[PDB]
Amino acid sequence: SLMDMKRTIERLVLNAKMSHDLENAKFVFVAFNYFTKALTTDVYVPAEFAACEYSLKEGIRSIYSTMIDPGQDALLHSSTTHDLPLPPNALGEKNMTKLYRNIVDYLSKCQGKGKTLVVFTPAENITMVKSCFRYLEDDFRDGKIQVFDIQYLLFILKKEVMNVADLNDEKINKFATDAFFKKDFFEFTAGIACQYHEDNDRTKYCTQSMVTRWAYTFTDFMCGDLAITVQPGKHIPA
Ligand SMILES: [Zn+2]
Numbered sequence: 001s002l003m004d005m006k007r008t009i010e011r012l013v014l015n016a017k018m019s020h021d022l023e024n025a026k027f028v029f030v031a032f033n034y035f036t037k038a039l040t041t042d043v044y045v046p047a048e049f050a051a052c053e054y055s056l057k058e059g060i061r062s063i064y065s066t067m068i069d070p071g072q073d074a075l076l077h078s079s080t081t082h083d084l085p086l087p088p089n090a091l092g093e094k095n096m097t098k099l100y101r102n103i104v105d106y107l108s109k110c111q112g113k114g115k116t117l118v119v120f121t122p123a124e125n126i127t128m129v130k131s132c133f134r135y136l137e138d139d140f141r142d143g144k145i146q147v148f149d150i151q152y153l154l155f156i157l158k159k160e161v162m163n164v165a166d167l168n169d170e171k172i173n174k175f176a177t178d179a180f181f182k183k184d185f186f187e188f189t190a191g192i193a194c195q196y197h198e199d200n201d202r203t204k205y206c207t208q209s210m211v212t213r214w215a216y217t218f219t220d221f222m223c224g225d226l227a228i229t230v231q232p233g234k235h236i237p238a
Helices: 002-018 074-080 096-111 123-136 148-165 175-185 195-199 207-225
Strands: 029-038 045-056 057-066 116-121 145-147
Touching: 002 148, 029 074, 029 096, 029 123, 029 207, 045 096, 045 123, 045 207, 057 096, 057 175, 057 207, 096 116, 096 123, 116 123, 116 148, 123 145, 123 148, 145 148, 148 175, 148 207, 175 207
Parallel strands: 029 116, 116 145
Antiparallel strands: 029 045, 045 057
16 A cells, blocks of 8 residues: 555655665666556557666666666657657567566666565555556566655655754755756756667656666755765766
């Protein structure tokens, strides 16, 4: 449930704080683009994926990024956002089974094997991201990746950072942290999109750019409370 997700995020962050390793807690951010959504069913057809692993101390530690060719409204959503070419001329990995395995391999290298995997994405994108993972599938069907709210993470993380920094502020609430996240202050950073999206100037809607911007947003919102040396590329734009 969403209530459950929220309590779980709070517990994750508090585990880190209590171990005195909040700055080293690692979080994986994910972003999907989709070509279109089935009219009657919860089926989003994936077009692009990125993931990154982030900690306050190290900033971006790794990034995984790929265009997706699923083979096949589609025109409108796609043309106004990512504008990736539609099937049968779509770019990217066309082996969906291989893609999913490669994504899980990446998440497992980050989080460990034999564990439920946890990733974060904007609240308004959770349904879509789960649907895209399902499209890519399964032993997973019969039975894996929990998709949590990155904005709730930002909120809880900011409050616990401020507690640690002896900076508690009753006036900082989730309206404020949501506002900061949605400002997208690093939208116009050069060189963080994939090559296609640099070519077609739709970097705003590039998954690789998006997970990088979210990382820079976390750093800008919190690393100042913590006396962490920010690193070019990793914490802030190169
Ligand atoms: Zn892209």
